[PDB]
């Protein structure tokens, strides 16, 4: 019976110059998980374990600096949530002396103002991602037939770790929630033209406006996580003798796919609670709309 939105962490933004995803939940960067996976490789790769020193000094700095960067946007985040709470509750909307179509544009102005803060405060941090990746690519080189027992042992464990995520359960959740949302936007198009109840219908139209944004993010991760699952499984189905140059390309293959897997799984569980909370608002509003 929830009527207001407490959590608005479903907002994310990708940088335009270089394409990186910034989520409000830690670690904020999918690359940080890729950095966290190299510690498992370094412990099992060879006697060289110098990454344990860079993981505690350089990797945590990026994570800690990014968490601060997201924390600077509290003023933007609280002001965005304020516009979201107003346009959702008619009891909180009838207090102000402004119209819905008048302050519905103020929402978009602040919605993008907050997303700009998530990127600008992390723009200085994205440079360290390319600086750490080069450092990882530099420290790993220290032969024409390097071993591969560790590479394939990771793929065998990833497939078991992939089954921990309910992908088939998340996929069916979309097609039923998406069609139910399309049936909701269809009903208001025929009631708003025959029934004169503008104040309540505006909240249902606004809630559906944000629902499409979260469905987009919930879908966008589902295929990208699926693409990682489908590729990591493809590397297993498709040696024991590899050069050291391809070993850097081989570790980046499993590293980029698994870091995307864990980062997308972090967004999906968050966007799941966001979608259910949005549906509870539009479900209990139909009881008041009728």
């Amino acid at each position, epitope marked *: 019976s929830t009527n*207001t939105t*407490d*959590n608005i*962490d479903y907002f994310d933004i990708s940088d335009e110059s270089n394409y990186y995803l910034i989520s409000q*939940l*830690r670690p904020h960067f999918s690359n940080i998980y890729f950095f966290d996976e190299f510690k498992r490789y370094a412990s099992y790769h060879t006697e060289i374990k110098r990454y344990e020193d860079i993981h505690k000094t350089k990797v*945590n700095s990026l*994570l*800690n600096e990014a*968490s*601060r960067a997201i*924390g*600077i946007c*509290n003023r933007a985040k*609280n002001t965005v949530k304020g516009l979201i709470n107003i346009l959702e509750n008619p009891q909180k909307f009838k207090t102000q002396r402004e119209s819905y179509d008048v302050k519905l544009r103020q929402y978009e102005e602040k919605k993008e103002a907050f997303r700009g803060c998530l990127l600008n405060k992390n723009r200085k941090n994205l440079d360290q991602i390319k600086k750490i990746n080069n450092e990882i690519r530099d420290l790993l080189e220290k032969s024409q037939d390097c071993q591969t027992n560790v590479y394939f042992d990771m793929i065998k464990i990833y497939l078991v770790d992939f089954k*921990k995520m309910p992908y088939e359960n998340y996929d069916t959740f979309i097609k039923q929630y998406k069609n139910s949302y399309l049936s909701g936007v269809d009903m208001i198009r025929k009631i708003e033209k025959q029934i004169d109840n503008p104040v309540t219908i505006n909240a249902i139209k606004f809630t559906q406006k944000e629902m499409g944004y979260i469905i987009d993010r919930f879908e966008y991760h589902l295929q990208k996580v699926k693409h990682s699952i489908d590729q990591v499984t493809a590397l297993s189905d498709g040696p024991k003798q590899v050069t050291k140059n391809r070993l850097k390309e081989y570790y980046f293959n499993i590293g980029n796919y698994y870091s995307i897997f*864990k980062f997308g*799984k972090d967004s999906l*569980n968050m966007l*799941n*609670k966001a979608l259910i909370h949005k549906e509870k608002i539009v479900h209990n509003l139909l009881g008041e709309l009728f």
Partner: antibody
Amino acid sequence: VQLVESGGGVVQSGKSLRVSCAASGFTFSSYGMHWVRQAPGKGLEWVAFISYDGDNKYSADSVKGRLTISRDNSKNTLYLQMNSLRPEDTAVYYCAKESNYGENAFDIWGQGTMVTVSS
Amino acid sequence: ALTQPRSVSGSPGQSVTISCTGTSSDVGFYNFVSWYQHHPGKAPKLIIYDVSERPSGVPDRFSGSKSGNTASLSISGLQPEDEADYYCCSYAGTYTFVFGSGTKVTVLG
């Protein structure tokens, strides 16, 4: 939303005690869980943290390498096990829940169970 | 352990404040500090998350503020139900948290 925890009354020194926090009224498998203990004299302090899956488990530096934390999503319980106890850590262990408003706050807390260390 | 006063005193209808200053990397670096109200036997409930905002059930009397490495909680219009122990909590970093020492807010009877 209710967080019920259960802990033993007395524990011998250097022995292990397991603490279980049963969650209900909300989706336990989607929220993070925290442990907080409070000595009879001092105030409460942060102890550890688990993600919703259990893949990320972290603890404070004071109890690092001494306290093991885990969760059972099917049984909907939060588990904390402390090994090699010392008479200085006898405290009321509270079961904290990750906040709905954000991951940097604690929304719902547990009642707290008293654990005494006397051999 | 963050440092806050040992005891603060206020009369019914008065306003008091509580300082919270730990380290330079704990409080003043993250803007993720928080405050919790602990009754003698009851479970501690969250009053103020982040720097200045409050959950839905928290009255208008509690105020959140922060400057530098010093966070501050403010309670205006004290009522006899406000007598409790108050702890500040800041995000330490690397998935860790730190709690304050605690203040025994006592309404003057």
